[PDB]
């Protein structure tokens, strides 16, 4: 009868963490089998970071003007190339700690673990989601970028983040481990600017059904709405509109649970006009979005 | 710019991690060098759990009553013995990836990681404070129970709880690495009950200056109190008393921000008396009490 935010375990990702060191820039790696990732921008100076022409920075680079620890060892590169916004670097060693892996992209909305490592050691480990407008609220500091994001599905981790840098606003901006961007985002230290976010309905939904599993009916109601009047109040409100796709997806929920999506719906239209009248939903006071329907169902069970 | 609940790295920790099987009973233990740490209620059977004799259940054990798996391995027990609430187990093999560590009881208000376990293997990691009525607000399902909890301080790994029950209201229960409660309860499925639970004021106001190191500050005020008058509040709104040695532990906080104790002390209580007028203090929009004032400082940096 308790629910929370739960991050994975992350022992299979410390084990791929390195150092890695280019003149007075440090920051974090991921070693894989003999390739360690990192963002490109470990290259350029103080001076660089304004308007860098990556192409012109790194053909003045050699595999020795890269430096790479793992604790005490150092790491010699043999090899080095451009993913777009990541560089590769190769090196005589294969990590004898390499997991099975995947390099996924995800969607919005969709949450992962980020393990925030600092001069290439672990630092700590939380869990995040991935905005509509492409950034995530977390907790980096300087030092943080290569930090990686990730979930584990059966013993096998999908790495999908890759930490890059914090906007004006607080928000941070990164890239899939293929250094394609998340978002509009570029790697320059320029005028950017996080778009307007907005809520995540479907994991909203999803948690008001984790709130019925755990014992909790208080907010349900019997009104119903239709998918295109609940919309009308998602865009007030400024929530996702819910969409066909959204509402199959909350079929297992909806089945443990008793309660027909639409209803589910006309309860957070209740809640949304009326807020919540100094009332909680599983301990919190306010409509929470960072759990997905596939996390509500990884943890909890009964009803 | 950005700030929040943080676990620490879990991997020390996953190699630890074991089965541990007694006629229909499975749970968790802890193998450390030749030894492996259980709950003692891992022997009774379903009737047994409402009135044990742990003394006579145990007399009627043999090592080989004992199933330990770590993944495939099966381990051989060679030896057993019964330590307040925990069993110790013996056995042929030093588990090699035994971490430097230490056995610490914890205070109230203190925080630490939880890994939390199923059939001997990590499932998430999420951090927790022992609250003032020596329970936790945890997230756990059938067989958590040898799920433990954990700091980390340059390497060592302080191990502080072992899981073995959840209360009525739905809070956790456990002991430390020798057995002892936390709090005054038994390993009795009995009527038993959390008592009165009241908010860690140590730790909402080293959350403040967290807030005010973030660069805000809207809550702060000109007013001041004395520590009896604060008390007087504290009271009423269930918060626990202020000491002049909680006074003593916010000075590193006082001194980088600025802000003297008993004026953050007046902000807080004009913040009790006068709610927040739909206001948040990062992103949160309740006085959150889960932070102590070195979990404050380990994150972050700079005003
Ligand atoms: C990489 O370690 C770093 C992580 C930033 C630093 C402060 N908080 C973070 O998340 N990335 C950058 O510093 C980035 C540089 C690349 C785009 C070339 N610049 C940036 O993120 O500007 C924001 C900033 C905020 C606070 C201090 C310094 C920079
Ligand atoms: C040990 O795996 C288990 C963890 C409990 C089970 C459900 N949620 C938990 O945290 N411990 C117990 O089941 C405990 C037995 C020892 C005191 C002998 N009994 C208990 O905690 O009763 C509460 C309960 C709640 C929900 C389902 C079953 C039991």
Tied chains: 1, 2.
């Excluded at 060892?73 to 990541?86: K, P």
Aim: glycine residues 8%; charged residues 15%; aromatic residues 10%.
């Amino acid at each position: 009868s308790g629910f929370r935010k739960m991050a994975f375990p992350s022992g299979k990702v410390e084990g791929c963490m390195v150092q890695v060191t280019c003149g007075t820039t440090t920051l974090n790696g991921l070693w894989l089998d003999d390739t360690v990732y990192c963002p490109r921008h470990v290259i350029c100076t103080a001076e660089d970071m304004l308007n860098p022409n990556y192409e012109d920075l790194l053909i003045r680079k050699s595999n020795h003007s890269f430096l790479v620890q793992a604790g005490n060892v150092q790491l010699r590169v043999i090899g080095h190339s451009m993913q777009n916004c990541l560089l590769r670097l190769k090196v005589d060693t294969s990590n004898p700690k390499t997991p099975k892996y995947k390099f996924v992209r995800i969607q919005p909305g969709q949450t992962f673990s980020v393990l925030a490592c600092y001069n290439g050691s672990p630092s700590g480990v939380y869990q995040c989601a991935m905005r509509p407008n492409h950034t995530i609220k977390g907790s980096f500091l300087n030092g943080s970028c290569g930090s990686v994001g990730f979930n584990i599905d059966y013993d096998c981790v999908s790495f999908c983040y890759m930490h890059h840098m914090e906007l004006p606003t607080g928000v941070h901006a990164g890239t899939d481990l293929e250094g394609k961007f998340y978002g509009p985002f570029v790697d320059r230290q320029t005028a950017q600017a996080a778009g307007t976010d907005t809520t995540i309905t479907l994991n909203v939904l999803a948690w008001l059904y984790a709130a019925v599993i755990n014992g909790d009916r208080w907010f349900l109601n019997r009104f119903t709405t239709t998918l295109n009047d609940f919309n009308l109040v998602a865009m007030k409100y400024n929530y996702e509109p819910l969409t066909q796709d959204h509402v199959d997806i909350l079929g297992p929920l909806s089945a443990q649970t008793g309660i027909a999506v639409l209803d589910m719906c006309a309860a957070l239209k209740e809640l949304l006009q009326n807020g919540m009248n100094g009332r909680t939903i599983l301990g919190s006071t306010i409509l929470e979005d960072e759990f997905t329907p596939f996390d509500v169902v990884r943890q909890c069970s009964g009803v």
